[PDB]
Amino acid sequence: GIKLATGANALDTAAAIRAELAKMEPFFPSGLKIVYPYDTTPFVKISI
Amino acid sequence: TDADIAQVQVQNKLQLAMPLLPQEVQQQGVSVEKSSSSFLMVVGVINT
Amino acid sequence: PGADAKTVQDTVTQVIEQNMNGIDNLMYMSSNSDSTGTVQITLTFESGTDADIAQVQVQNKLQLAMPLLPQEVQQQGVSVEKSSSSFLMVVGVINT
Amino acid sequence: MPNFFIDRPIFAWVIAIIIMLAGGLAILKLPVAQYPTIAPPAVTISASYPGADAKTVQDTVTQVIEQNMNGIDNLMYMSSNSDSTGTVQITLTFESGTDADIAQVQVQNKLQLAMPLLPQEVQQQGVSVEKSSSSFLMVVGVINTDGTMTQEDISDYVAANMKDAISRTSGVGDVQLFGSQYAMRIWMNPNELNKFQLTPVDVITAIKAQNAQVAAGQLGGTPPVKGQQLNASIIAQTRLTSTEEFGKILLKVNQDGSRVLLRDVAKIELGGENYDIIAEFNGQPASGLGIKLATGANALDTAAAIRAELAKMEPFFPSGLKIVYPYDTTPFVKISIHEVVKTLVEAIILVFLVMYLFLQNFRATLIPTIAVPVVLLGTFAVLAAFGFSINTLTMFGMVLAIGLLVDDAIVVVENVERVMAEEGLPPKEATRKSMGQIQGALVGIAMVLSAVFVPMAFFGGSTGAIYRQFSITIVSAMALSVLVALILTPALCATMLKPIWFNRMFEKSTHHYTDSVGGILRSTGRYLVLYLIIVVGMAYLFVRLPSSFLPDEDQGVFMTMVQLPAGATQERTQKVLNEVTHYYLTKEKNNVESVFAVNGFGFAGRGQNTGIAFVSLKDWADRPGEENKVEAITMRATRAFSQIKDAMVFAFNLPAIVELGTATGFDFELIDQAGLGHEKLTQARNQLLAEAAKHPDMLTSVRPNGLEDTPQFKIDIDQEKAQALGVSINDINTTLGAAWGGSYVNDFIDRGRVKKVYVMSEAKYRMLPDDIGDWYVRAADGQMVPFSAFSSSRWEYGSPRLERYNGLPSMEILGQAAPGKSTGEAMELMEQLASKLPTGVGYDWTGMSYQERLSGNQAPSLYAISLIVVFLCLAALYESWSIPFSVMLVVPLGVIGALLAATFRGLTNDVYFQVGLLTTIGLSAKNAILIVEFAKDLMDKEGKGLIEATLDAVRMRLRPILMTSLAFILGVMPLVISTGAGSGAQNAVGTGVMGGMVTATVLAIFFVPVFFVVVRRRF
Amino acid sequence: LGTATGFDFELIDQAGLGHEKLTQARNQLLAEAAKHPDMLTSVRPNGLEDTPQFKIDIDQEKAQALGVSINDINTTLGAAWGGSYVNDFIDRGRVKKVYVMSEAKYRMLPDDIGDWYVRAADGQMVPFSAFSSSRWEYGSPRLE
Amino acid sequence: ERLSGNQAPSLYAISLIVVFLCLAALYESWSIPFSVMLVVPLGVIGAL
């Protein structure tokens, strides 16, 4: 459960997390999958 | 209020309480810091 | 507690002083060690210095030199406070 | 506006004097820097575990405090290294704009959560969190003119009396002592200890018990009894002070009265806390302090505070002790700024004389020459308002703003002179007419020239600060140059111009008569058939050297990394450093003044098999010629040190930043995201090194930064046997550590100073594996048993310096871009690591490569925006969409000239070159308006023929163009041939601008058919 | 702020001379400055002069021969005469300290040191006099 | 006091320079300002 640091952009913080997860993905064990069961950023994009 | 100066203000008088804390609390170590109360995004990991 | 001017100087004041570098805008530093088990180091900073940042920097230098102090001093506690204007008022409480 | 001051000259003189005074006060409090604080802040956590190995100082220390380095904001990355000396070094690098104080206070709060989890040895040694540069602001050696003090004694004096006073100086990030202060060294003798049935544990306990400072209360302390008539302190035993008091420490009393004292089973002396660092100055024994610069602190003021602090401890030195500076990078900054402030005054002297050859009147040439300093002083004040300092960029700016500044003073003065000569008006009416004519035109070219630099302030990037500094400096100067042209010069030219040698003016008359005659032949197509050659010189004519933003110059100093083969001792490194010092002081004597060889100082990692020699060169004047330059000295040194056996001696040049820009190389880091371990990671590094070895064209000098695995002595202590024999595991571990690693016991008082007490084996008894046999442990029954009785030892292999990048194990591969080819494209490693390495090993970039990842191709956008904005400003100034084209075709000429020297003199496309190009592209444009403005004005008045006013009645007014061009060619003449400090950037701008303007003065005045092509070729 | 006429001079000890030599230097400086009443007045030391202190020398050889942990002697002396703070206790709603100290009347004169006994390693109580000597000396009550 | 180095004279020398200049801009003469600057002591003597 990642939080947003006091005074940081939600869309820059969420893109950075996704980039880090992408770069860690190739080294995962044989069976493992990242899912996003709760994210408030898609809403921001839609509202903008 | 800039959160950095607020954090240092809180910290530099929290450390005035260490004499009054049971010596046990100090071994664990308190952690004064900026914090939010809600999650930006939960990133789940499953095994397919 | 129980220490003297030179017991508390050799064990506390020198230890604290030697680990009190890397603090910005420090005009000077003067310390007293009383025969009453007391150390009263005082760091005077350049005018126009931020009091909060200076105090937190000092508190930072002090909490890494704490492990070098005697167990009695650590147990009692070392307090860093930014000395400021005199008492706004004094509220005596008496018993008749 | 230039009418209220014409009748009130005293009001315009007061404004000028006020601006000059404001400019003076600014400089007095304006920081002399070198570049405007480009390096991102970095916070270093350094801890110490006595007697540890790289593995035992990482598993217990490094990744115990590194797992807590979370929740720190504005953190680009974090790299830690832990070596066999027992030291850790965690560097957290933050974003460029971060506040170092808040970054040091959050790194401290998060380290305190891991502080109680560390071993007690690490805690009581002292963990230091300190924000500072990665390289030394300076080094302050300490020699002995006599021979009464050895390097150990000099180091002790420096540490006790100088190191802490210096370290409290504001601006001093951190001081590294090239030595070690005294400590009570107890050299235990295992034979004597075994003879008396003693162990190092017993010695340590005895020292702790008999060396203490006891608080014993008071004789009349409170709460008081009634009738107390005395009060005094009770003074129980104190800390021992001299080697004699320690010698009498009674370890035990024999049953027959034979007292056993410490001096019986040990040698007591005063010796350094650590014997690693050994400094030498030109051969003799010495010590010193290497001082770093606190992040975001001025180097000049810090060095001044350091030299001042040393000058008040100097009266109290012991007789013979002296103070030297074998490494200081601030004198170069001071001397370089002296050269810029001198070429500033010199580019004022040069116009002053040029406008004499043309105006031929002392009074007339005195109007613009005093309009230059005012602006220059004024702009300094402006910088003081904007918070900028006096650095090489801001100052090279001031120098490049000499022509753009004086051009209008020239325009105003020549216009008033021309109108007086023609219409014979008195000076006051002459200027009341000249200003009413050309007031708004001169302001309009102010807007145009700023549109070349205003887009540069909003560049955006790591290097955007440099561009912003330069752009602000020029924009302010030009704005002030126009204020002056509208306020003072109208008031001056109204009063000090007379209301009224020969060969020079006659020759000039013939010259511009021939020039006008040549220009009359404007109807000729080859002017432009030829212009195509100039146009095609953009995609090509580029030597394509974008491999430099900042030219690395002498600095009057360099280091000499010495890296012996892993497993070397201190004597071998000392021999190699003696060879290096002898080479420098014998073969390179006419350049090297001193060599401060620090044996044991590890640039990458402190150790015995490492060294470094700070070399200071003689006065730049005493080194004439390129052959006596740093880049050359270092090349020759490296060659001469390739004949040395069993050593890596690399003499290199430090760049202008504290540290960045290794010849545009790459800083690869191979990390592993699986639990592969050190073996598989080392094998992956080997595979990548082999793959990069067979691509010399694409990669070169792929050196693995760090130490290579070395033999180590693994001594298994069989605990079951220890319990069987009655010895305790704690006794075994304490004996081994305190015998071979040294065990800090407690403090003592030397000359009224708290110093450490160390217990360690005598050197001779801990030298070889066989010496393990000398050490006995007392069992629970008093029987001493050896280590051989319960231990088995062998030789294994282990790394002496383990690194981690962002919390994972890593190996750093430094490298150069490629032979000939540049970096960026040299990132073949991205496609060479995944396909040629096992699974589980990733790869990353750090430092220079990290910053260049986010930055890079942004200058072309700046050029495009500037050009469009300039074109628009011209259209506004001219009220026509087609006229600006006739002025935007003069930019090619200046661009192509600047490239004459990028070709002839191998100049790189430096940021200096970029700002120098911009200078003459908005200036070739400036001189183009000087011609098209009067052409248009005469076309709408006093002759409406296009040809009449285009190349005939305006070309003849070519005096201003020639005066300005010659005035700004003489001004930048020193910059080109300068050999003083910073001659690098000096030449970089000087040559580029000179070449630019010289080809943009001769090709522009003659490409006048562009204003004659207005007829039908509109846009 | 401080009075305008006033000045705050310092006599640093830049060579590790010691307390006695620095005191001698301060006395010399004050004596010399007392010879310029026309210019300097009320020139006095801000600190406190040395006072008698009761030094107790625990003889190491005596203590070991008798058999007793010198740490035990030091702890006994400190806790009896100065007061060793031990633990924290909660009473109603806040932690309050627990101080161990000697009763007032037993730590008021030098002779009182003889009332305190230290248990030997073999369970036999030895008086302080057996392993310790004492006398009056001079020490600074405030070192700056 | 020792650190400052008696900057008050330097700050007030600047004021004898700037006041003179501002008066020269007002009276458009370099001599008339002296008539105003000679009235400085008239109040100082009375105050003293």
Coordinates of C-alpha atoms in Angstrom, one line a residue, chain D residues 316-724:
Chain D
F316 CA 51.0 28.6 19.3
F317 CA 52.7 25.9 17.2
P318 CA 55.6 24.0 18.7
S319 CA 59.0 25.3 17.6
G320 CA 59.9 24.0 14.1
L321 CA 56.4 23.0 13.0
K322 CA 55.3 24.8 9.8
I323 CA 52.2 24.9 7.5
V324 CA 52.0 24.2 3.8
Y325 CA 49.2 23.9 1.2
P326 CA 50.2 21.1 -1.2
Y327 CA 46.7 21.1 -2.8
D328 CA 44.3 24.1 -3.2
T329 CA 41.8 24.5 -5.9
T330 CA 40.6 28.0 -4.9
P331 CA 43.7 29.9 -6.1
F332 CA 42.9 28.8 -9.6
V333 CA 39.4 30.3 -9.3
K334 CA 40.7 33.6 -7.9
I335 CA 43.3 33.9 -10.6
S336 CA 40.9 33.0 -13.4
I337 CA 38.4 35.6 -12.3
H338 CA 41.3 38.1 -12.2
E339 CA 41.9 37.3 -15.9
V340 CA 38.2 37.9 -16.8
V341 CA 38.0 41.2 -14.8
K342 CA 41.2 42.2 -16.6
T343 CA 40.0 41.3 -20.1
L344 CA 36.9 43.3 -19.0
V345 CA 38.9 46.4 -18.3
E346 CA 41.0 45.6 -21.4
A347 CA 38.0 45.4 -23.7
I348 CA 37.1 48.9 -22.4
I349 CA 40.6 50.3 -23.2
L350 CA 40.4 48.7 -26.7
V351 CA 37.1 50.4 -27.7
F352 CA 38.2 53.7 -26.1
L353 CA 41.1 53.7 -28.7
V354 CA 39.1 52.4 -31.7
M355 CA 36.4 55.1 -31.4
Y356 CA 39.3 57.5 -31.4
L357 CA 40.5 56.3 -34.9
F358 CA 36.9 57.0 -36.0
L359 CA 35.6 59.9 -34.0
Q360 CA 39.0 61.6 -33.9
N361 CA 37.9 63.8 -30.9
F362 CA 38.8 63.2 -27.2
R363 CA 35.5 64.7 -26.0
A364 CA 33.4 62.8 -28.6
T365 CA 35.0 59.4 -27.7
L366 CA 34.5 60.2 -24.0
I367 CA 30.7 59.8 -24.2
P368 CA 30.5 56.1 -24.9
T369 CA 33.6 55.0 -23.0
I370 CA 31.9 56.2 -19.8
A371 CA 28.6 54.5 -20.9
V372 CA 30.4 51.1 -20.7
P373 CA 31.5 51.1 -17.0
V374 CA 28.1 52.4 -15.7
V375 CA 26.2 49.5 -17.4
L376 CA 28.9 47.0 -16.2
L377 CA 28.6 48.3 -12.6
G378 CA 24.9 48.5 -12.9
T379 CA 24.5 45.0 -14.1
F380 CA 26.5 43.7 -11.2
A381 CA 23.9 45.4 -8.9
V382 CA 21.2 43.6 -10.9
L383 CA 22.8 40.3 -10.2
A384 CA 23.0 41.1 -6.5
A385 CA 19.2 41.5 -6.7
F386 CA 18.7 38.2 -8.6
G387 CA 20.9 36.4 -6.1
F388 CA 23.6 35.3 -8.6
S389 CA 27.4 35.4 -7.9
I390 CA 30.5 36.5 -9.8
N391 CA 31.5 33.3 -11.6
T392 CA 33.3 32.5 -14.9
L393 CA 29.9 32.3 -16.7
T394 CA 28.5 35.6 -15.4
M395 CA 31.9 37.2 -16.0
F396 CA 32.4 35.8 -19.6
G397 CA 28.9 37.1 -20.1
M398 CA 29.9 40.6 -19.0
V399 CA 32.9 40.3 -21.4
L400 CA 30.6 39.2 -24.3
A401 CA 28.3 42.1 -23.4
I402 CA 30.8 44.8 -24.4
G403 CA 29.9 45.2 -28.1
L404 CA 26.1 44.8 -27.7
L405 CA 26.4 47.4 -24.9
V406 CA 28.6 50.0 -26.7
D407 CA 26.8 49.7 -30.1
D408 CA 24.0 52.2 -29.2
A409 CA 26.3 54.7 -27.4
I410 CA 28.1 54.6 -30.8
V411 CA 24.8 54.9 -32.7
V412 CA 23.7 57.9 -30.6
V413 CA 27.1 59.7 -30.8
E414 CA 27.6 59.2 -34.5
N415 CA 24.1 60.2 -35.3
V416 CA 24.4 63.5 -33.4
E417 CA 27.8 64.1 -34.9
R418 CA 26.5 63.5 -38.4
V419 CA 23.5 65.8 -37.9
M420 CA 25.7 68.6 -36.5
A421 CA 28.1 68.2 -39.5
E422 CA 25.3 68.1 -42.0
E423 CA 22.7 70.7 -40.8
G424 CA 25.1 72.6 -38.6
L425 CA 22.9 72.7 -35.6
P426 CA 24.1 73.5 -32.1
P427 CA 24.7 70.4 -29.9
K428 CA 21.5 70.8 -27.9
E429 CA 19.2 71.1 -31.0
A430 CA 21.3 68.5 -32.8
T431 CA 20.5 65.9 -30.1
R432 CA 16.9 67.1 -29.5
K433 CA 16.5 66.1 -33.1
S434 CA 18.7 63.0 -33.2
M435 CA 16.9 61.5 -30.2
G436 CA 13.5 62.4 -31.5
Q437 CA 14.5 60.6 -34.6
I438 CA 16.0 57.4 -33.3
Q439 CA 14.7 57.0 -29.7
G440 CA 12.2 54.2 -30.4
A441 CA 14.4 52.4 -33.0
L442 CA 17.2 51.9 -30.5
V443 CA 14.7 50.4 -27.9
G444 CA 13.3 48.2 -30.6
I445 CA 16.7 46.6 -31.3
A446 CA 17.0 46.2 -27.4
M447 CA 13.9 43.9 -27.6
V448 CA 15.2 42.1 -30.6
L449 CA 18.6 41.3 -29.0
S450 CA 17.0 40.1 -25.7
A451 CA 14.8 37.6 -27.7
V452 CA 18.2 35.8 -28.4
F453 CA 18.8 35.4 -24.6
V454 CA 15.4 35.6 -22.8
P455 CA 14.4 32.0 -24.1
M456 CA 17.8 30.8 -22.6
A457 CA 16.8 31.7 -19.0
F458 CA 13.8 29.2 -19.3
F459 CA 16.1 26.5 -20.8
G460 CA 15.3 23.8 -18.2
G461 CA 17.7 21.0 -17.3
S462 CA 20.8 20.1 -15.2
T463 CA 22.8 22.7 -17.2
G464 CA 19.9 25.1 -17.3
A465 CA 21.5 27.1 -14.4
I466 CA 24.5 28.0 -16.5
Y467 CA 22.3 29.2 -19.4
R468 CA 20.1 31.1 -17.0
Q469 CA 23.1 32.9 -15.5
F470 CA 24.5 33.9 -18.8
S471 CA 21.1 35.0 -20.2
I472 CA 20.3 37.1 -17.1
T473 CA 23.7 38.7 -17.1
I474 CA 23.4 39.7 -20.8
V475 CA 19.6 40.7 -20.7
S476 CA 20.3 43.0 -17.7
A477 CA 23.4 44.6 -19.3
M478 CA 21.6 45.2 -22.6
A479 CA 18.5 46.7 -20.7
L480 CA 20.9 49.0 -18.8
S481 CA 22.9 49.9 -22.0
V482 CA 19.6 51.1 -23.4
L483 CA 18.6 52.9 -20.2
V484 CA 22.0 54.7 -20.4
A485 CA 21.6 55.4 -24.1
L486 CA 18.2 57.1 -23.4
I487 CA 19.3 58.9 -20.2
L488 CA 23.0 59.8 -20.0
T489 CA 24.4 59.8 -23.5
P490 CA 21.6 62.3 -24.6
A491 CA 22.6 64.5 -21.7
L492 CA 26.4 64.1 -22.3
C493 CA 26.2 64.4 -26.1
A494 CA 24.2 67.6 -25.5
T495 CA 26.9 69.3 -23.4
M496 CA 30.4 67.9 -23.8
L497 CA 30.3 67.8 -27.6
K498 CA 32.0 70.9 -29.1
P499 CA 29.5 73.1 -31.1
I500 CA 31.6 72.7 -34.3
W501 CA 44.8 62.5 -38.2
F502 CA 44.0 64.1 -41.6
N503 CA 45.5 61.1 -43.4
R504 CA 43.3 58.7 -41.3
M505 CA 40.0 60.4 -42.1
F506 CA 41.0 60.9 -45.8
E507 CA 41.9 57.2 -46.0
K508 CA 38.6 56.2 -44.4
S509 CA 36.8 58.5 -46.8
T510 CA 38.4 56.7 -49.8
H511 CA 37.6 53.4 -48.1
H512 CA 33.9 53.8 -47.6
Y513 CA 33.7 55.6 -51.0
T514 CA 35.0 52.4 -52.6
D515 CA 32.7 50.3 -50.3
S516 CA 29.7 52.3 -51.5
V517 CA 30.9 51.9 -55.1
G518 CA 31.1 48.2 -54.7
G519 CA 27.7 48.0 -53.0
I520 CA 26.1 49.9 -55.8
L521 CA 26.6 46.8 -57.9
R522 CA 23.9 45.1 -55.9
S523 CA 22.2 43.6 -59.0
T524 CA 24.2 40.4 -59.3
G525 CA 22.9 36.8 -58.7
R526 CA 26.2 35.3 -57.5
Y527 CA 26.0 37.2 -54.2
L528 CA 23.3 34.5 -53.4
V529 CA 24.5 31.6 -55.6
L530 CA 27.4 32.0 -53.2
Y531 CA 25.1 32.3 -50.1
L532 CA 24.1 28.7 -50.8
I533 CA 27.6 27.6 -49.8
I534 CA 27.2 29.4 -46.4
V535 CA 23.7 27.8 -46.0
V536 CA 24.9 24.3 -46.6
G537 CA 27.5 24.8 -43.9
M538 CA 25.0 23.9 -41.1
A539 CA 24.3 20.2 -41.5
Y540 CA 28.0 19.8 -42.3
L541 CA 31.0 22.0 -41.3
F542 CA 30.1 20.6 -37.9
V543 CA 33.3 18.8 -36.6
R544 CA 30.5 17.1 -34.5
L545 CA 32.2 17.5 -31.2
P546 CA 29.2 17.7 -28.7
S547 CA 31.4 15.7 -26.3
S548 CA 32.1 18.7 -24.0
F549 CA 30.1 21.1 -22.0
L550 CA 33.1 22.2 -19.9
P551 CA 36.8 22.2 -20.9
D552 CA 39.0 20.6 -18.2
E553 CA 42.0 22.9 -17.5
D554 CA 45.1 22.9 -15.3
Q555 CA 43.6 24.0 -11.9
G556 CA 47.3 24.3 -10.9
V557 CA 46.8 20.7 -9.3
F558 CA 46.2 17.0 -10.0
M559 CA 46.2 13.7 -8.1
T560 CA 48.0 10.4 -8.8
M561 CA 46.0 7.3 -8.0
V562 CA 48.2 4.4 -6.9
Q563 CA 46.5 1.0 -6.7
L564 CA 48.8 -1.9 -5.9
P565 CA 47.8 -5.5 -6.5
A566 CA 45.3 -6.7 -4.0
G567 CA 47.1 -8.2 -1.0
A568 CA 49.9 -5.6 -1.0
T569 CA 51.3 -4.3 2.3
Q570 CA 52.0 -0.8 3.5
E571 CA 55.7 -1.0 2.7
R572 CA 55.1 -1.9 -1.0
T573 CA 52.7 1.0 -1.4
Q574 CA 55.2 3.3 0.3
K575 CA 57.9 2.1 -2.2
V576 CA 55.6 2.8 -5.1
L577 CA 54.7 6.2 -3.7
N578 CA 58.3 7.0 -3.2
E579 CA 59.0 6.1 -6.9
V580 CA 56.1 8.4 -7.9
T581 CA 57.3 11.3 -5.8
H582 CA 60.9 10.9 -7.1
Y583 CA 59.6 10.9 -10.7
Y584 CA 57.6 14.1 -10.1
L585 CA 60.3 15.9 -8.1
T586 CA 63.2 14.9 -10.5
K587 CA 61.8 14.5 -14.0
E588 CA 58.9 17.0 -13.6
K589 CA 60.7 19.5 -11.3
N590 CA 60.2 22.6 -13.5
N591 CA 56.4 22.2 -13.0
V592 CA 55.7 20.3 -9.8
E593 CA 56.4 22.4 -6.7
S594 CA 55.2 19.8 -4.1
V595 CA 54.0 16.2 -3.9
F596 CA 51.8 15.2 -0.9
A597 CA 51.9 11.4 -1.0
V598 CA 49.3 9.8 1.3
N599 CA 50.1 6.2 1.6
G600 CA 47.0 4.2 2.7
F601 CA 44.5 6.8 1.7
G602 CA 42.0 5.0 -0.5
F603 CA 40.4 7.3 -3.1
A604 CA 37.8 4.5 -3.9
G605 CA 38.4 2.6 -0.7
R606 CA 40.8 3.1 2.1
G607 CA 43.3 0.2 2.5
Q608 CA 46.9 -0.8 2.8
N609 CA 47.3 -1.5 -1.0
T610 CA 46.2 2.0 -2.0
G611 CA 47.8 5.4 -2.2
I612 CA 47.4 8.9 -3.6
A613 CA 49.7 11.8 -4.2
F614 CA 48.3 15.4 -4.4
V615 CA 50.6 17.2 -6.8
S616 CA 50.7 21.0 -6.9
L617 CA 52.1 22.7 -10.0
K618 CA 54.2 25.9 -10.1
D619 CA 52.8 29.4 -11.1
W620 CA 51.0 29.2 -14.5
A621 CA 53.5 31.8 -15.8
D622 CA 56.4 29.5 -14.6
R623 CA 54.9 26.8 -16.8
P624 CA 55.1 28.3 -20.4
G625 CA 53.9 26.1 -23.3
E626 CA 51.4 23.3 -23.8
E627 CA 54.0 20.7 -23.0
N628 CA 53.9 22.0 -19.4
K629 CA 50.1 21.7 -19.0
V630 CA 48.2 19.3 -16.7
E631 CA 46.6 17.1 -19.4
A632 CA 50.2 16.7 -20.8
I633 CA 51.9 16.3 -17.5
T634 CA 49.3 13.6 -16.6
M635 CA 49.7 11.8 -20.1
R636 CA 53.5 11.8 -19.7
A637 CA 53.3 10.6 -16.1
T638 CA 50.9 7.8 -16.9
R639 CA 53.3 6.7 -19.7
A640 CA 56.3 6.8 -17.4
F641 CA 54.4 4.9 -14.7
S642 CA 53.5 2.1 -17.1
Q643 CA 57.0 0.7 -16.7
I644 CA 56.4 0.2 -13.0
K645 CA 55.9 -3.4 -11.9
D646 CA 52.9 -4.6 -9.8
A647 CA 51.0 -1.3 -9.5
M648 CA 48.4 0.8 -11.3
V649 CA 49.6 4.4 -11.2
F650 CA 47.1 6.7 -13.0
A651 CA 47.8 10.4 -13.0
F652 CA 44.6 12.2 -14.0
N653 CA 43.1 15.8 -14.1
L654 CA 40.3 16.8 -11.8
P655 CA 37.4 18.6 -13.7
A656 CA 35.9 22.0 -12.7
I657 CA 33.0 20.4 -10.8
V658 CA 33.9 18.9 -7.4
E659 CA 33.7 15.6 -9.6
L660 CA 31.7 14.9 -12.9
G661 CA 32.5 14.5 -16.6
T662 CA 35.2 11.8 -17.1
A663 CA 35.9 12.7 -20.7
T664 CA 32.2 11.9 -21.5
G665 CA 32.7 8.3 -20.4
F666 CA 30.1 6.0 -18.9
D667 CA 29.7 4.8 -15.3
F668 CA 27.9 1.5 -15.7
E669 CA 26.8 -0.4 -12.6
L670 CA 25.9 -4.1 -12.8
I671 CA 23.4 -5.0 -10.0
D672 CA 21.8 -8.3 -9.3
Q673 CA 18.1 -8.6 -8.4
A674 CA 18.3 -12.3 -7.5
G675 CA 20.1 -13.8 -4.6
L676 CA 22.9 -14.9 -6.9
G677 CA 25.7 -13.9 -4.5
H678 CA 29.1 -12.4 -5.1
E679 CA 30.4 -15.4 -7.2
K680 CA 27.8 -15.2 -9.9
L681 CA 27.8 -11.4 -9.9
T682 CA 31.6 -11.5 -10.3
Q683 CA 31.3 -14.0 -13.2
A684 CA 28.7 -11.8 -14.9
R685 CA 31.0 -8.8 -14.5
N686 CA 33.8 -11.0 -16.1
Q687 CA 31.6 -11.9 -19.0
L688 CA 30.6 -8.3 -19.6
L689 CA 34.2 -7.2 -19.4
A690 CA 35.2 -9.8 -21.9
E691 CA 32.3 -8.7 -24.2
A692 CA 33.3 -5.1 -23.9
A693 CA 37.0 -5.9 -24.5
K694 CA 36.4 -7.2 -28.0
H695 CA 34.6 -4.0 -29.1
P696 CA 37.4 -1.5 -29.1
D697 CA 35.7 0.6 -31.8
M698 CA 32.5 1.0 -29.7
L699 CA 34.0 0.9 -26.2
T700 CA 37.4 1.6 -24.6
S701 CA 38.9 1.5 -21.1
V702 CA 36.1 -0.6 -19.5
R703 CA 37.8 -0.7 -16.0
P704 CA 36.1 -2.5 -13.1
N705 CA 36.2 0.1 -10.3
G706 CA 37.0 -1.7 -7.0
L707 CA 39.1 -4.3 -5.3
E708 CA 39.4 -7.9 -6.6
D709 CA 38.8 -10.9 -4.4
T710 CA 41.8 -11.7 -2.1
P711 CA 42.8 -14.5 0.1
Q712 CA 41.6 -14.4 3.7
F713 CA 42.2 -16.6 6.8
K714 CA 39.0 -18.5 7.9
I715 CA 39.4 -19.8 11.4
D716 CA 36.5 -22.0 12.4
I717 CA 36.1 -22.0 16.2
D718 CA 34.6 -25.4 17.1
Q719 CA 32.3 -24.3 19.9
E720 CA 31.6 -27.9 21.1
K721 CA 35.3 -28.4 21.7
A722 CA 35.4 -25.0 23.5
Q723 CA 32.7 -26.1 25.9
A724 CA 34.4 -29.5 26.4

